[PDB]
Amino acid sequence: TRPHASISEKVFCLIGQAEGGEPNT
Amino acid sequence: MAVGEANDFLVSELKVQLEDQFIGTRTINTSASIIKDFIQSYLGRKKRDNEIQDFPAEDVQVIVEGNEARISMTVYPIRSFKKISVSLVYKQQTLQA
Amino acid sequence: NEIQDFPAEDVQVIVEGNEARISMTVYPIRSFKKISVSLVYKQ
Amino acid sequence: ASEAKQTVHTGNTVLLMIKGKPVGRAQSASGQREYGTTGVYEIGSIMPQEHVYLRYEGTITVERLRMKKENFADLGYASLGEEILKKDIIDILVVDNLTKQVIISYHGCSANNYNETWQTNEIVTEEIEFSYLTASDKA
Amino acid sequence: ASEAKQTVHTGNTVLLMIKGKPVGRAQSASGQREYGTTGVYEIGSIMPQEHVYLRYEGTITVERLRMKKENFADLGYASLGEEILKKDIIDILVVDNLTKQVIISYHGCSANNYNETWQTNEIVTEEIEFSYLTASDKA
Amino acid sequence: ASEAKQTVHTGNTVLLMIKGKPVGRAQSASGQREYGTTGVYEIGSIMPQEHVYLRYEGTITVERLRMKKENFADLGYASLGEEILKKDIIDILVVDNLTKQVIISYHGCSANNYNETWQTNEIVTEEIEFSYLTASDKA
Amino acid sequence: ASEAKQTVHTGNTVLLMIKGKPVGRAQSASGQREYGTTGVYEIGSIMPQEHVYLRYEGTITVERLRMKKENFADLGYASLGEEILKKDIIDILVVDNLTKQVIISYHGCSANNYNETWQTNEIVTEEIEFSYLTASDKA
Amino acid sequence: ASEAKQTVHTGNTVLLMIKGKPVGRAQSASGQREYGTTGVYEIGSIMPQEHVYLRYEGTITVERLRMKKENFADLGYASLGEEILKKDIIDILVVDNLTKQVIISYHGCSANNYNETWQTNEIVTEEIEFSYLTASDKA
Amino acid sequence: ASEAKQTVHTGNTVLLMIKGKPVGRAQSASGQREYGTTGVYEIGSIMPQEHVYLRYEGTITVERLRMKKENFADLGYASLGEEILKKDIIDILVVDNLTKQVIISYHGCSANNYNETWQTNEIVTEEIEFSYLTASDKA
Amino acid sequence: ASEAKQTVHTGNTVLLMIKGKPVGRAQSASGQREYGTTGVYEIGSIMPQEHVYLRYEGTITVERLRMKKENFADLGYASLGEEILKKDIIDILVVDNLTKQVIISYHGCSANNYNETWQTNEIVTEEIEFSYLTASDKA
Amino acid sequence: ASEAKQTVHTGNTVLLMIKGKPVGRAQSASGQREYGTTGVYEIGSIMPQEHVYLRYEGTITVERLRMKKENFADLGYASLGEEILKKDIIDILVVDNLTKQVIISYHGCSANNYNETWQTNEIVTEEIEFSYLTASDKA
Amino acid sequence: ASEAKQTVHTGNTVLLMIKGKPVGRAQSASGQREYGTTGVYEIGSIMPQEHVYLRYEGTITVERLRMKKENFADLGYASLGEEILKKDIIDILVVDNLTKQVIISYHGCSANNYNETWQTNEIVTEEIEFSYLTASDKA
């Protein structure tokens, strides 16, 4: 939290079965 | 501290020029719609010199009772820039002849 | 503009000789003297 | 009819103000403003596809009777000779009398040209033209 | 005789509108239109062989008494200061108040200059000029 | 005195015509024409030896009251916006009423500029300026 | 009421002087003043960033009835012919006759043009223009 | 008068097309040619025997107001730095706006320069001076 | 004044004839013929003792408004690309309108440069520069 | 009309950024980039068969009104004498006002000539001409 | 507005000084510089590798109304005939009129030319185009 | 203002004296003197380390309205043909009107070019350009 450095219009949807992520979001 | 320094010198310059304009006491017949206008004018001048980014003139109000005025206002400060982070990824692709 | 205002109805006079009892009122030119601001910063 | 209920402003109700003090015996005030608008023409068509604002130009002229004292030269809002280079930017406001309420405001006027007149048997009159940074109204 | 028989339009019956709203206390309106009309001249003859058009131009000006409320700057149309950069395209119409029938339309007006006039012992008056993209005849 | 025997034409006797149909409520018609004449000067002498006609220039202006219907826009002799490019060349004639006899004729007019006016309590009026190929009279 | 109470200057009380002497039968006087007032305009903003001054200018003109004696040419001030080359710098003042109080001074006038007007059944009139180096306010 | 019946090209009736797409807000489209003609002079006579061609040269200049998108860099024609070597032969046409019929084509071009101007209270522009191999036309 | 009596040639009394047809809607034609005339100087005497003539540098430029069709290239006088090749020698005459007597003639012209110019709004203009073998005339 | 909807770039919607700061009170910036493009000719055929590119001749000029202090030389971009030496490469950007999205950029400028101009009365003006290694942009 | 509060140099607030003395009735003081910059081109690429300096060049031109005394010959700067060889390095400054603070200095100059004009009913002038070695400044 | 007190030289206070006589009805005289001043540069250091002077390129032009007789050629200063030969060196002086004190002088002029110009209607004008051995003065 101190100041530091370190090193189109048509929206699209996808829905299907895969592993990971919260259910129903 | 630097935000406080900028504030201290802004309010001092504001406090000073309000002396000449109104606290010179010349009459009560300069009402509160003129004081609102004067603070808008002066915020314009400091906006011209970029010391404040912009001001909502609609959200400025003045109330006057006897020989005392009460004023509310809002200022957008020159917004600072705290942090950067860079994701650097190495890749390879062939040179050919 | 040497006074703020004056009431027209509230003048009463009674006279008897050199004596002349005059009742009058004036709104004084009051002088503005105090300011208080509430400075606030947003975004 | 009465001042509180008329729907149109008049010279009878308005008061002109400058640096927080009223103007004495103003005869007129005109404000001319231009936006230098220009139409975007093309080959292949005869009428402009759209207009664009190019520049802000502001003018105001005030006509006044020459007060015996406290005219513009005496009061310091204007000055003769060398002195104009010493003078600050000045704010002029229009204000309705009954409520002392700002109608418009000429933020930061500065003089352009100054015209005066004396005539036989007749009133001495003045005129000053200013230019200004911006004009705005609120409340 | 009645307004239902007279053959000529009059300011008496004509109303004025802007952005779906009627204008109060509108005094006068000028509509000027031009085409760059130009003559194709020759060697071997003194007369023009034909006339042509090359650039459309046209201007509407509107004169109005300064209202105590909802004037052009207070209503949000052509105004003073920085806000001109954010005043979008707006249309103006001329209407017959008797039947609410549109006389003409000025498609896509934009501001050019704004004159405000104050004179002692006179009503406050205004005079605004607009360019516009098209005229049309309907009804 | 009577129409048949007066030796001077008046607006009272004349009728204005366009495309074989009379004009309604014309208030005036002016026709300006130039020959661009120039004097042939020399060295050795101070005055021109002779004049020469350089170019033909034709202008006509017509002022009209705004008819409720069948004005120039409604009747198709003039048009707003895009539409002028679709319109043909138009012939205007001057004709004495009593004999329906042509006085002059503006062969093939074409619009230059178009001016309209609305005012409080007062008549709505129009103006159009045309240019023409040639002007001539016969019989 | 009396000339010792009225708040406005009038040609009635105002006197005119030139080189320590009062002018007889002076009709009118114009004083114009200018500063070359100019706007500093920008890329990135439409409004002016500030106004400035760059060249002072100003002119006094004086109108006078041709006196039978001691007119401008007979008195030795602005005159006709070669003698203009030898008319030195001269100052003009405006004074209040009631108190002999100076209103303004025009420092270092010089002649620009001299109009003399003769018309049958009218008084002979004159109209002279001067540039001058400075205006000042005193008393 | 009308579009179909005139017989000279006004700037109205010409489209400018490039890479098979019409251009918005183009201004000039000047096309210049030099066939380096210089006839053979010949000792024994004063005058050239026949005029003969020594090198074709073809330049087409296009000037345009800078649009916010689809400028000549976005449409791919112009470019900055070394990237030009990646570019290919651009292709340009001049077309009848009324019928979309080609007047002339420029069948192979490349840029010479890409001049640009930003100025106070003015509209920005692109300029391109293309060189080209050949010009031709059918129908 | 009249054509039948004037002493001077004008744009309206001349026709420009190319390959037996009149040129339509030209704007100007200008011809330079320079002999390269040069004086022969000498040691001992500073001034030249005769002139001699070098090369018949003979040219005519034609500037014209673009006919909607049948322009130079379309009708077959100007050319583009390797069309320049095939376009054999062309003849031009300047002709006195009433009688079509020859004024002057150009045996065998040949093109130098061809410039077609499109611009915003205005009429399209064309320029051609011709060089010729020998100018000549007969009465 | 409005900034949020106009299709064209203007002097008022652009900012010129040098070394991370906006330039104040510029008057114009103009950039020429010429590739030296030249056609390759051939014996036997008169016309060139391709173009090729020679040298990236890339320049930008900046003209500015002299700020009272912090001008180019004072703030450390321009230089005088053997200061030119020490002034390493400088970068310039042309910036879209609202979003400060890049319009175009100049990787590594370098000074050519520096002209400071004082004149009677008027504002002091400054001119600098820069040549750069490669112009470039990203959206 | 005022002198101390503007932030651009008007011709009013600049003195021109030379040989440690202020100049009367000077007009322009244009100072131009060329660092002969021409970056190295390099076979194998289209664009210059780095921009590098090839010869300093500094010119300052001063133009002045010819004063009756203390002209640039009397002040010793200019001279006529061989006498120039007796002259030495002249020295020039540009200064804040309001504070007598140097803006810039030209630390060693010599005359190129001393152009002069007398003309009918016009004011005479000197012109000098000095060349100079270096320019510098402190505070 | 007056001749006896003005600080500046003017067209009306100067006389041009050639061979002991005043020139009549000149319009302008202008003189350029250029020393060919050039800086001496050096390997290793980019800036020149002194200036040096090359050739005294000294010239005066005289433009005059042709006196009916006693012009330059007639009176014996200009020449024609091998008269140039015999016309030995001529001297010219520029003279302060009242005192006829020297302003500057030209030891030994010599003609370069002589231009007599006749035009339609207007006054005949003459131009001569002289080059001189050394300009000089004494108070």
By the CB < 8 Å criterion, does G43 face chain H?
A: yes
Q: Kind and range of the H or E element at E16? A: strand E14-18
Q: At what angle do helices B2-18 and B32-48 cross, to 10 degrees?
A: 140
By the CB < 8 Å criterion, does I99 face chain E?
A: no
Task: Say if the Cβ atoms of K9 and J124 lie within 8 Å.
Answer: yes
SS3 state of residue B4? helix
Write out the E strands in H7-76.
Answer: 14-18, 26-34, 57-65
Q: How far, in Å, CA of I55 to CA of K67, rounded?
A: 55
Q: Please, are residues K41 and K87 in contact by the beta-carbon 8 Å criterion?
A: no
Taking the CA of residue B34 and the nearest CA in chain D, the distance in Å comes to 6
Taking the CA of residue G43 and the nearest CA in chain J, the distance in Å comes to 5
Q: How far, in Å, CA of F59 to CA of F106, rounded?
A: 10
The single residue listed with the structure tokens 């062309």 is I90
> What's the Cα-to-Cα distance from E69 to each of D6, D103, E51, F94, rounded to whole Å?
10, 10, 49, 52
> What's the Cα-to-Cα distance from F45 to each of B27, F40, I35, L121, L123, rounded to whole Å?
80, 11, 33, 8, 13
Q: What HEC string does chain J produce?
A: CCCCCCCECEHHHEEEEECCEECCCEEEEEEEEECCCEECCECCECCCCCEECCCCEEEEEEEEECECCCCHHHHCCCCCHHHCCCCCCEEEEEEECCCCEEEEEEEEEEEEEEEEEECCCCECEEEEEEEEEEEECCC
By the CB < 8 Å criterion, does I15 face chain E?
A: yes
Task: Say if the Cβ atoms of H9 and I68 lie within 8 Å.
Answer: yes
Number of H–I residue contacts, CB under 8 Å: 107
Taking the CA of residue L12 and the nearest CA in chain K, the distance in Å comes to 6
Task: Say if the Cβ atoms of B85 and A6 lie within 8 Å.
Answer: yes
Task: Say if the Cβ atoms of E118 and D14 lie within 8 Å.
Answer: yes
User: Nearest CB to E44: which of I12, I121, I122?
Assistant: I12
Task: Say if the Cβ atoms of C42 and B74 lie within 8 Å.
Answer: yes
Report chain H residues whose CB lies below 8 A from the CB of G43: 118-120
Neighbouring CB atoms inside 10 A of B65's CB total 8
Q: Please, are residues G91 and G109 in contact by the beta-carbon 8 Å criterion?
A: yes
List the chains bordering chain H where 3 or more Cβ pairs fall under 8 Å.
D, E, F, G, I, J, K
> What's the Cα-to-Cα distance from D10 to each of D15, D138, L56, rounded to whole Å?
10, 20, 76
> What's the Cα-to-Cα distance from C16 to each of C11, C22, C23, rounded to whole Å?
17, 12, 15
By the CB < 8 Å criterion, does E85 face chain H?
A: no
Residue D135 pairs with which residues in a beta bridge?
D106
Report chain D residues whose CB lies below 8 A from the CB of F85: 46
Q: How far, in Å, CA of D81 to CA of D23, rounded?
A: 23
SS3 state of residue B2? helix
Q: Which of H28, H30, H10, H19 is nearest to H97 (CA)?
A: H10
> What's the Cα-to-Cα distance from C14 to each of C8, C19, C20, C21, C23, rounded to whole Å?
17, 9, 6, 5, 9
Q: How far, in Å, CA of J80 to CA of D106, rounded?
A: 44
Q: How far, in Å, CA of C29 to CA of B67, rounded?
A: 11
* Sequence-distant (≥ 6) Cβ neighbours of residue F63 within 8 angstroms: F26, F27, F28, F29, F125, F126, F127
L118 to chain F: nearest residue by CA? F43
Q: How far, in Å, CA of J117 to CA of K29, rounded?
A: 6
Q: How far, in Å, CA of J77 to CA of H106, rounded?
A: 45
Rounded to a whole number, what is the largest CA-CA distance in chain K?
A: 64
Residue B62 pairs with which residues in a beta bridge?
B71
The single residue listed with the structure tokens 């391709």 is J50
By the CB < 8 Å criterion, does D46 face chain I?
A: yes
E67's tokens? 């209202």
Report chain I residues whose CB lies below 8 A from the CB of H47: 55-56, 58, 133-134
Q: How far, in Å, CA of H20 to CA of H8, rounded?
A: 25
Taking the CA of residue I48 and the nearest CA in chain E, the distance in Å comes to 44
Taking the CA of residue G34 and the nearest CA in chain K, the distance in Å comes to 15
Burial class (CB in 10 A: 0-12, 13-18, 19+), E94: buried
Q: Please, are residues D132 and D57 in contact by the beta-carbon 8 Å criterion?
A: no
Report chain L residues whose CB lies below 8 A from the CB of J85: 46
Q: Which amino acid is at E104?
A: I
List the chains bordering chain J where 3 or more Cβ pairs fall under 8 Å.
D, E, G, H, I, K, L
Q: How far, in Å, CA of E131 to CA of D35, rounded?
A: 11
Task: Say if the Cβ atoms of E50 and H1 lie within 8 Å.
Answer: yes
SS3 state of residue I43? coil
I90 to chain H: nearest residue by CA? H51
Report chain H residues whose CB lies below 8 A from the CB of I56: 46-48
Task: Say if the Cβ atoms of E52 and H8 lie within 8 Å.
Answer: yes
By the CB < 8 Å criterion, does H74 face chain J?
A: no
Report chain L residues whose CB lies below 8 A from the CB of K65: 8
Taking the CA of residue H119 and the nearest CA in chain G, the distance in Å comes to 7
According to DSSP, the β-strands at E50-52 and L57-65 are unpaired
Q: How far, in Å, CA of D138 to CA of D103, rounded?
A: 8
Task: Say if the Cβ atoms of D122 and G10 lie within 8 Å.
Answer: yes
Report chain H residues whose CB lies below 8 A from the CB of K47: 81-82
Q: Which of H139, H125, H118, H136 is nearest to H61 (CA)?
A: H125
Phi, psi of E9 (to 5 degrees): -70, 145
Neighbouring CB atoms inside 10 A of H30's CB total 16
Q: Please, are residues E114 and E62 in contact by the beta-carbon 8 Å criterion?
A: no
Terminal CA-to-CA distance of chain F, rounded, Å?
Answer: 24
List the chains bordering chain A where 3 or more Cβ pairs fall under 8 Å.
B
By the CB < 8 Å criterion, does K46 face chain H?
A: yes
**DSSP code of G98?**
T
Neighbouring CB atoms inside 10 A of E124's CB total 23
By the CB < 8 Å criterion, does H136 face chain G?
A: no
**Between chain C and chain I, are at least 3 CB pairs below 8 A?**
no
Number of D–G residue contacts, CB under 8 Å: 106
Q: Kind and range of the H or E element at I34? A: strand I26-34
Taking the CA of residue I39 and the nearest CA in chain E, the distance in Å comes to 39
Report chain K residues whose CB lies below 8 A from the CB of D83: none
Q: How far, in Å, CA of H6 to CA of G10, rounded?
A: 68
* Sequence-distant (≥ 6) Cβ neighbours of residue G70 within 8 angstroms: G24
F13-44 burial: b if 16+ Cβ within 10 Å, else e? bebbbbeeeebeebeebebeeeeeeeeeeeee
Task: Say if the Cβ atoms of D46 and F85 lie within 8 Å.
Answer: yes
Report chain L residues whose CB lies below 8 A from the CB of K111: 35, 37
By the CB < 8 Å criterion, does H85 face chain K?
A: yes
By the CB < 8 Å criterion, does J7 face chain D?
A: yes
Q: Please, are residues F115 and F124 in contact by the beta-carbon 8 Å criterion?
A: no
Task: Say if the Cβ atoms of G41 and H118 lie within 8 Å.
Answer: no
Neighbouring CB atoms inside 10 A of I47's CB total 10
Q: Which of E11, I122, D88 is nearest to B45 (CA)?
A: D88
Q: Please, are residues K120 and L27 in contact by the beta-carbon 8 Å criterion?
A: yes
SS3 state of residue F72? helix
Region for residue G54 given its phi and psi (left: phi exceeds 0; alpha: psi -120 to 50; beta: otherwise) = alpha
**Between chain A and chain D, are at least 3 CB pairs below 8 A?**
no
Task: Say if the Cβ atoms of G87 and L5 lie within 8 Å.
Answer: no
Q: Which amino acid is at K64?
A: R
Residue D60 pairs with which residues in a beta bridge?
D31, D130
K22's tokens? 């202020």
Q: What HEC string does chain K produce?
A: CCCCCCCECEHHHEEEEECCCECCCEEEEEEEEECCCCCCCCCCCCCCCCCCCCCCEEEEEEEEECECCCCCCCCCCCCCHHHHHHCCCEEEEEEECCCCCEEEEEEEEEEEECCEEEECCCECEEEEEEEECCEECCC
Q: Please, are residues H89 and H38 in contact by the beta-carbon 8 Å criterion?
A: no
* Sequence-distant (≥ 6) Cβ neighbours of residue F124 within 8 angstroms: E8, E9, E10, E11, E14, F65, F66, F116, F117, F118
Q: Please, are residues F104 and F14 in contact by the beta-carbon 8 Å criterion?
A: no
Q: ∠ CA F104-F106-F109 to the nearest 5 degrees? A: 165
Q: Please, are residues E68 and E82 in contact by the beta-carbon 8 Å criterion?
A: no
Q: How far, in Å, CA of B40 to CA of B59, rounded?
A: 11
User: Nearest CB to I80: which of H16, H47, H134?
Assistant: H134
Q: How far, in Å, CA of J112 to CA of J129, rounded?
A: 5
Q: Which of I135, I102, I107 is nearest to I15 (CA)?
A: I102
Residue H137 pairs with which residues in a beta bridge?
none
Phi, psi of E109 (to 5 degrees): -75, 160
Report chain E residues whose CB lies below 8 A from the CB of G46: 84-85
Number of D–K residue contacts, CB under 8 Å: 15
E107's tokens? 């498609």
D53's tokens? 């604002």
B29's tokens? 């017949």
Write out the E strands in chain B.
Answer: 61-65, 68-72, 84-85
* Sequence-distant (≥ 6) Cβ neighbours of residue F69 within 8 angstroms: none
Report chain D residues whose CB lies below 8 A from the CB of F82: 46-47
The single residue listed with the structure tokens 């583009």 is I80
Q: Which of J98, J132, J139, J138 is nearest to J18 (CA)?
A: J132
Phi, psi of L92 (to 5 degrees): -130, 145
B97's tokens? 């002849």
L6's tokens? 């003005």
H16's tokens? 């400018």
